[PDB]
Amino acid sequence: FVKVVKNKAYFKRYQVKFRRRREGKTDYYARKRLVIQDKNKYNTPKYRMIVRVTNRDIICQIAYARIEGDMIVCAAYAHELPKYGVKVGLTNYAAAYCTGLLLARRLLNRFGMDKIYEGQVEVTGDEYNVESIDGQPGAFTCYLDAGLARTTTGNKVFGALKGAVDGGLSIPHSTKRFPGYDSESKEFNAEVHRKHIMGQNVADYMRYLMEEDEDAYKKQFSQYIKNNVTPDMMEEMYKKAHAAIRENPVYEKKPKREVKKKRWNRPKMSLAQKKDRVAQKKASFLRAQERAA
Amino acid sequence: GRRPARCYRYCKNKPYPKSRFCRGVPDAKIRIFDLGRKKAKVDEFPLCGHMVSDEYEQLSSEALEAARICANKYMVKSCGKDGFHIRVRLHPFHVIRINKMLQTGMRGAFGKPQGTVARVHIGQVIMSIRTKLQNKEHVVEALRRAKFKFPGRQKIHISKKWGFTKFNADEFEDMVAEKRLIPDGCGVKYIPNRGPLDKWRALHS
Amino acid sequence: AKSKNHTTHNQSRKWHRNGIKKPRSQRYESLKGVDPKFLRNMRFAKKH
Amino acid sequence: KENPMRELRIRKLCLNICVGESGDRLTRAAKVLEQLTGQTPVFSKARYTVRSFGIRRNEKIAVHCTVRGAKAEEILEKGLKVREYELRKNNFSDTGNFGFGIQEHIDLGIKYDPSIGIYGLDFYVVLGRPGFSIADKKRRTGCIGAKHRISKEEAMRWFQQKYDGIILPG
Amino acid sequence: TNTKGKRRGTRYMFSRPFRKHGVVPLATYMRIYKKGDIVDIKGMGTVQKGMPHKCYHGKTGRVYNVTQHAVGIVVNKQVKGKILAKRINVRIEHIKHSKSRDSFLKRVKENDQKKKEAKEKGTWVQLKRQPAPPREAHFVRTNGKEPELLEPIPYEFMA
RNA sequence: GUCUACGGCCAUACCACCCUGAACGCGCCCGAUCUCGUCUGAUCUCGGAAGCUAAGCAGGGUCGGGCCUGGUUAGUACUUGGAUGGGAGACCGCCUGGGAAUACCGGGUGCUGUAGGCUU
RNA sequence: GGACAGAAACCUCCCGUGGAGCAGAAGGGCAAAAGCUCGCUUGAUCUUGAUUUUCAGUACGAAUACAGACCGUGAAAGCGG
RNA sequence: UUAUCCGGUAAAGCGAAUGAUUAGAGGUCUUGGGGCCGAAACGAUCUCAACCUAUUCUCAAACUUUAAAUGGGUAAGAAGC
Ligand SMILES: [Mg+2]
Ligand SMILES: [Mg+2]
Ligand SMILES: [Mg+2]
Ligand SMILES: [Mg+2]
Ligand SMILES: [Mg+2]
Ligand SMILES: [Mg+2]
Ligand SMILES: [Mg+2]
Ligand SMILES: [Mg+2]
Ligand SMILES: [Mg+2]
Ligand SMILES: [Mg+2]
């Protein structure tokens, strides 16, 4: 026949990966080079601007490494955008910019530097770096963490990066992976980046669908219709969302409702129960065998 | 032209078996370790005796085979052709080195392999014989005769186990009646209660 | 004209005759071999 | 009733031609299935050198292509129509995939060209179920699952019930 | 004579333990090391950069210099006649904190606390670690049953 | 009670199969115009929200394999020091102290850090 | 499993803890890498010190942490004399 | 002595990795060898061989899951809190 590869000795010699590696969530090779501060810094925190894109929202946080795990200082999500004006379309490039801007301004509010480090009040789409000013406390600087995202040109991870940079965070970067950097001539024009920041590509697609096939337009965009969001006012709405975010970036926690203490999963079986089950099974098997014989 | 056993009678050196670093070793003289009707069930051959050494010595492969032949000859003569089972529980692996002169002298003194020798510890069993209960005197005489083929001191002991098994003879039939042991030829299979119950229900089926 | 090659028989007795003394620890160990940038910072601090 | 997410759909239909040599014959064979599939195929380079076949390492000896979507369905349909919608159960693998081979590409519906000649193809179908993408997704790769696999019996039942084919024993 | 290789005879010393191969834990990289801290040396074969020499494996030293990835330490190496307090540079993953100093630190903090306390109360307490004294007199209560009688068992050849 | 994002310790967490998943979340899933990449929108990137727990993922189960930790093995094997001890030797016994590993037989099957949710 | 296809040519699916590969002899080490394929480049560069390795605690060779400029790569954290 | 770190020898193990090594068992068409009914047929039948599954006997200075005794560093304060 065939030799059983996963035999009793296979598990004896088997070495498991880390829990995150087995689950595939994290990349420890990049984490080592991302979270490890120099030893001569003597416990100076190193901040990573973590960006994650899910199927329905975008998570933007900043964290520093510790022996008991990372500490989340400021967390910004995309499901809270409807509080600011973006009612629908929370997983696009424009939403990535908005949540990155929200994370930056909220962090500045937490550290009490809202008025200082204004940053890009209005969008431009070109390269920009927050330059620290003398006398005033120095600017907050962190480093981008894309995780496992395949960082090509025009990624929503970089969109969140641009939003945070415009928010006032001095994150090192370059205008190479931003949408608009063409590779045939190796140059960057801010106009295309501005269109992607404001979601003009989505509006153009919306116009294209409603012009060539209305039924497919309904099939693709339906929540936009339900929220009566037309392409013409798309950029104006995002500008309003940017103004609202930069106005009131604070976060308030929802009140903790008191539970009724109801368990939703079957509790673990105990030793007595499992030792009784085999006794019942053996007794049933023999009593069935004798009466069937 | 083989040297007397008195030369290689002491476990003088650390074990030096035939391996990737030792090539050209001549094949061991003894290659058959089981004799008689080795295709015998554990039920029909309860009695078991053992030839066990009483010193930390070295037994050559040729000595092992000579004792095996002598024991086999007596068993087939007394108990019958198909009425016993002789198992040699020592395999010669420690190869021995021979330095031969032809006037080089002691320069480059490292012997080439000459033969294979089995190293025996205190109380380790050298030979085992399994047969019926009434054939006890014949086995004792057979091993006593084979003692003369070995150097050092060896003794004959009749183990309390059931044949070539690690279970006591008195409780062996009781356990197999309780269906804790399954005969599978010259040995037995021990059935614990730690497996899935499908095996248990199949056995009790 | 052969002779033995290496020996370490009486060496331990030779060592312990004068004693295997540990190095005499002394307060304010020297600052050689430290990071030059850190050393420059310290010297500037002592200067000012 | 049944959960719609367990529907058996074709994930990939791969067509390859192994001419066993490089050069004009390789290009000529490549043009055949290129004209068939409407897309550029890819050459495969040999791994080892054996003198029995006269093939050496890194030698482009076969041309293969993969087709998805509706065009894969049409190619499979015209491939089966020359096999008369019949297959042997040996063609079905243990993993729910199957395949067959055609001796000449002319019978599919292409027009013969004396400069082109005739060439055979191997049509291999790998069936699939919604959710097989987690077996190769980059972010969180996971095992497909015991109940979500496609059995050999399940695959042949799908074949004989969807295309109304027959699986004679053998 | 033997070869003078740097890693000669380190087949098992630098080898990773059983079922602990692969990616190194990040806790070692995250721990901080001040100068003057007592530290231990244990070479690890996963990272070959800044490998401490085999003569220092298992030794305990004091940190006197810290860099971005490695720390400079001073260790006592025994040479033929004397002991040399020589300084080496070792990458951080080959080094770990030692609890030998921590035990003294906890004890000195405890006795300082118990010296500040009860000082104004007038009582005097023991502070020096007295060695384990001989067991004091005590009563053994044979509660009923007679003590078991033990005798050597007869010899039998189990083999 | 529990989930998501980032983790620490790296199987008590793995592996095979089976059962249950309120809500939220994670996904499965629908398309290629744009960003982007392929032989193929399969993967990747992007734009999404019709349907679905079927799968992953969560919890539970297997007189489960494994893994962790106990008893047995056993004061056995081995061993610091000692003897004008035995034995021709091989080696063995004793005094003073330390003290293993199999097989075999039991128990258990992730703890927790920061932030944000569901259980209004 | 799939035409010629055969034991071995090529294509597809599943299992697959390193049973492969890393230039050589061997050992150690390595699985989204240290390995296989690409893209871009010369940190195989210029300079002063400190330390480890046989050690006499002297050299050469080799090696390790840093420091000052010029850089390469990557979106970046970082990595590379 | 009290705490705290390092080892891979002694011992032990192959139902655990690697290299050896013995003999019984049960499987199947996974193949071959000695046949047989057959145009043939995995249609069927004894085997004998290799293969798989649990086992069993004996080994390693250049093997090892475990793992000592002896031993090797550090600390046991006012150069400290
Ligand atoms: Mg990366
Ligand atoms: Mg010798
Ligand atoms: Mg798709
Ligand atoms: Mg599910
Ligand atoms: Mg178990
Ligand atoms: Mg938690
Ligand atoms: Mg890589
Ligand atoms: Mg430099
Ligand atoms: Mg050694
Ligand atoms: Mg040994």
Curated annotation (Swiss-Prot), chain A:
A single GO BP: translation
Q: Which UniProt keywords apply?
A: Acetylation, Cytoplasm, Isopeptide bond, Nucleus, Phosphoprotein, Ribonucleoprotein, Ribosomal protein, RNA-binding, rRNA-binding, Ubl conjugation
Q: Where Phosphothreonine occurs, residue numbers? A: T230
Task: Name the Gene Ontology molecular function terms of this record.
Answer: 5S rRNA binding; structural constituent of ribosome
What Gene3D superfamilies does the record point to? 3.30.420.100
Biased composition annotated in UniProt, kind: Basic residues: 256-266
Subcellular localization is given as: Cytoplasm; Nucleus, Nucleolus
Per its UniProt record, what CDD domains does this chain match? Ribosomal_L18_L5e (cd00432)
Sequence positions bearing N6-acetyllysine = K3, K46, K218
Give a yes or no for keyword rRNA-binding in this entry.
yes
The primary site where this protein sits is: cytoplasm
Pinpoint the Glycyl lysine isopeptide (Lys-Gly) (interchain with G-Cter in SUMO1) cross-link: K218
Q: Where is this region: Disordered?
A: 251-293
User: GO terms for CC?
Assistant: cytoplasm; cytosolic large ribosomal subunit; nucleolus
Q: Which residues carry this modification: Phosphoserine?
A: S183, S270
Record's SUPFAM superfamilies? Translational machinery components
InterPro entries, A to Z: Rbsml_uL18_euk (IPR005485), Ribosomal_uL18_C_euk (IPR025607)
Domain of life the protein comes from:
Eukaryota
- For the cross-link Glycyl lysine isopeptide (Lys-Gly) (interchain with G-Cter in SUMO2), the position is K218
Report quaternary structure and partners.
Component of the large ribosomal subunit (LSU). Part of the 5S RNP complex, which is a LSU subcomplex composed of the 5S RNA, RPL5 and RPL11. Component of a hexameric 5S RNP precursor complex, composed of 5S RNA, RRS1, RPF2/BXDC1, RPL5, RPL11 and HEATR3; this complex acts as a precursor for ribosome assembly. Interacts with isoform 1 of NVL in an ATP-dependent manner. Interacts with RRP1B. Interacts with IPO5, IPO7 and KPNB1; these interactions may be involved in RPL5 nuclear import for the assembly of ribosomal subunits.
Q: Which family does it belong to?
A: Belongs to the universal ribosomal protein uL18 family.
- Name the UniProt record assigns to this protein: Large ribosomal subunit protein uL18
From Swiss-Prot, chain C:
Question: Phosphoserine occurs at which residues?
Answer: S30
Q: Which residues carry this modification: N6-acetyllysine?
A: K32
Q: Which residues carry this modification: N6-methyllysine?
A: K4
Q: Where is the composition biased (Basic residues)?
A: 1-25
Compartments reported by the entry: Cytoplasm
| Segments for region (Disordered) | 1-32
- Top-level taxon in the UniProt lineage: Eukaryota
Stated role: Component of the large ribosomal subunit. The ribosome is a large ribonucleoprotein complex responsible for the synthesis of proteins in the cell.
Note the subunit structure. Component of the large ribosomal subunit.
Give the record's family classification: Belongs to the eukaryotic ribosomal protein eL29 family.
Q: What is this protein called?
A: Large ribosomal subunit protein eL29
Q: Which gene encodes it?
A: RPL29
From Swiss-Prot, chain D:
Phosphothreonine occurs at which residues? T37, T40
Query: Any transmembrane segments, and where?
Result: none
Entry keyword Ubl conjugation: yes
Superkingdom of the source? Answer: Eukaryota
Q: Which is one GO molecular function term here?
A: structural constituent of ribosome
Instruction: Locate the N6-acetyllysine modifications and list their residues.
Output: K45, K78
One GO cellular component assignment for this chain's record is: ribonucleoprotein complex
Cell location: Nucleus, Nucleolus; Cytoplasm
Task: Keyword check for Iron-sulfur, yes or no.
Answer: no
Annotated crosslink Glycyl lysine isopeptide (Lys-Gly) (interchain with G-Cter in SUMO2) location: K31, K45, K147
Keywords attached to this Swiss-Prot or TrEMBL record, sorted alphabetically, are: Acetylation, Cytoplasm, Isopeptide bond, Nucleus, Phosphoprotein, Ribonucleoprotein, Ribosomal protein, RNA-binding, rRNA-binding, Ubl conjugation
GO annotation, biological process: translation
Q: What family name appears in the similarity comment?
A: Belongs to the universal ribosomal protein uL5 family.
Q: What does this protein do?
A: Component of the ribosome, a large ribonucleoprotein complex responsible for the synthesis of proteins in the cell. The small ribosomal subunit (SSU) binds messenger RNAs (mRNAs) and translates the encoded message by selecting cognate aminoacyl-transfer RNA (tRNA) molecules. The large subunit (LSU) contains the ribosomal catalytic site termed the peptidyl transferase center (PTC), which catalyzes the formation of peptide bonds, thereby polymerizing the amino acids delivered by tRNAs into a polypeptide chain.
Could you identify this protein by its name? Large ribosomal subunit protein uL5
Taxonomic lineage is: Eukaryota, Metazoa, Chordata, Craniata, Vertebrata
Curated annotation (Swiss-Prot), chain E:
Q: Does the keyword GTP-binding apply?
A: no
Q: What is its main location?
A: cytoplasm
GO:BP terms for this protein? translation
Which Gene Ontology MF annotations are present?
structural constituent of ribosome
Subcellular location(s) of the protein = Cytoplasm, Cytosol; Cytoplasm; Endoplasmic reticulum
Q: Which UniProt keywords apply?
A: Cytoplasm, Endoplasmic reticulum, Ribonucleoprotein, Ribosomal protein
Q: Enumerate the residue ranges of region (Disordered).
A: 111-144
Look up the domain of life of the source. Answer: Eukaryota
Q: Which InterPro entries match?
A: Ribosomal_eL21 (IPR001147), Ribosomal_eL21_CS (IPR018259), Ribosomal_eL21_sf (IPR036948), Translation_prot_SH3-like_sf (IPR008991)
Pfam families reported for this sequence: Ribosomal_L21e
Query: Has the keyword Cytoplasm been applied to this entry?
Result: yes
* Purpose: Component of the large ribosomal subunit. The ribosome is a large ribonucleoprotein complex responsible for the synthesis of proteins in the cell.
What family name appears in the similarity comment?
Belongs to the eukaryotic ribosomal protein eL21 family.
Per UniProt, subunit arrangement is: Component of the large ribosomal subunit.
Q: Which named protein is this? A: Large ribosomal subunit protein eL21
To which species is this protein native?
A: Oryctolagus cuniculus
Lineage of producing organism: Eukaryota, Metazoa, Chordata, Craniata, Vertebrata
